[PDB]
């Protein structure tokens, strides 16, 4: 194909403050959303039906992540803690304490026996899911950490920070394997095959790097991104796209190889801070900040 057919199907309302992140369940079943109103909300992925609300954090939440088996959720909050929840009961299974400032990002590893976290304390922390104990505290960066992500088999961690660096660490030892160096790097994540790394910088630019070689392979422009840490995604179910939010209330979709903008989705009324792609269907979830506070589902 040359251009996708993304049309709006549902607009989800419920959050009373700005939404911070939206993540599809690995089983393609649910969509989890986190808000600055200290709440997580679970919605149906294909009908948008509100299913439940998860509460417990004392301050706003910046990120959510699912277990691989779609049974657990992890939450990073301003209350300096992460929280592991059982999605079905909604009860908090564990509280990860250790960071000394706002926890900004979190993610499970594929095994979902470890959790990686970044925080305003400029460190990356690796926690054991079973016990909730902190296994490792890597002095990751010199400034707030914007994103943390495991690779395809969980052997690597990638981290980004406002200090302008991206860093690949060996999970088993915690040692820094690679550093690419400066505008603030606001987002980072591995490609599906684990060979590439997508990094967004606060100069309205995305870059697909091959960290093996330490070389920038693609550059995506046209959108607006200078202030907020906006999520980006590889869209793999249909055509191979790069999807992102933007500070001009648009959802940008580039063709990965051509890097040309293939679509700009209109609807949100504020900065689209988070986007997520469905694991099996051509479904995109977008979330925006206050003045909007809604989640929009798009199908192609």
């Amino acid at each position: 194909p040359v251009k996708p057919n993304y049309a709006l199907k549902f607009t989800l309302a419920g959050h009373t403050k700005a939404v911070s992140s939206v993540k599809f369940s690995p089983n393609g079943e649910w969509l989890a959303s986190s808000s600055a109103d200290k709440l997580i909300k679970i919605w149906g992925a294909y009908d948008g039906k509100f299913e439940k609300t998860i509460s417990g954090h004392k301050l706003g939440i910046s990120d959510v992540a699912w277990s691989s088996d779609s049974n657990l959720l992890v939450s990073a909050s301003d209350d300096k803690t992460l929280k592991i929840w059982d999605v079905s009961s909604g009860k908090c299974l564990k509280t990860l304490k250790g960071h000394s400032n706002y926890v900004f990002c979190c993610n499970f590893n594929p095994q979902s026996n470890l959790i990686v976290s970044g925080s305003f304390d400029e460190s990356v922390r690796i926690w054991d899911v079973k016990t909730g104990k902190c296994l490792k505290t890597l002095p990751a960066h010199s400034d707030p950490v914007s994103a943390v992500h495991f690779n395809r088999d969980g052997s690597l961690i990638v981290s980004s920070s406002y200090d302008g660096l991206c860093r690949i660490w060996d999970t088993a030892s915690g040692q820094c394997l690679k550093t690419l160096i400066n505008p603030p790097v606001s987002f980072v994540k591995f490609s599906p095959n684990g060979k590439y790394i997508l990094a967004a910088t606060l100069d309205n630019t995305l870059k697909l790097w091959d960290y093996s070689k330490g070389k920038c392979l693609k550059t995506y422009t046209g959108h607006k991104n200078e202030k907020y840490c906006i999520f980006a995604n590889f869209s793999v179910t249909g055509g191979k796209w790069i999807v992102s939010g933007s500070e001009d209330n648009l959802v940008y979709i580039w063709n990965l190889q051509t890097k040309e903008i293939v679509q700009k989705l209109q609807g949100h009324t504020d900065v689209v801070i988070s986007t997520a792609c469905h694991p099996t269907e051509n479904i995109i979830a977008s979330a925006a900040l206050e003045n909007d506070k809604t989640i929009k589902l798009w199908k192609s």
Binding site: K17, A18, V19, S20, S21, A36, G60, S62, D63, D78, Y102, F104, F120, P144, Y162, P184, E226, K227, Y228, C229, I273, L289, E290
Partner: peptide, 10 residues
């Protein structure tokens, strides 16, 4: 903190 401009407003 992801929904704020704290670092940019400094």
């Amino acid at each position: 903190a992801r929904t704020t401009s704290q670092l940019y407003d400094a």
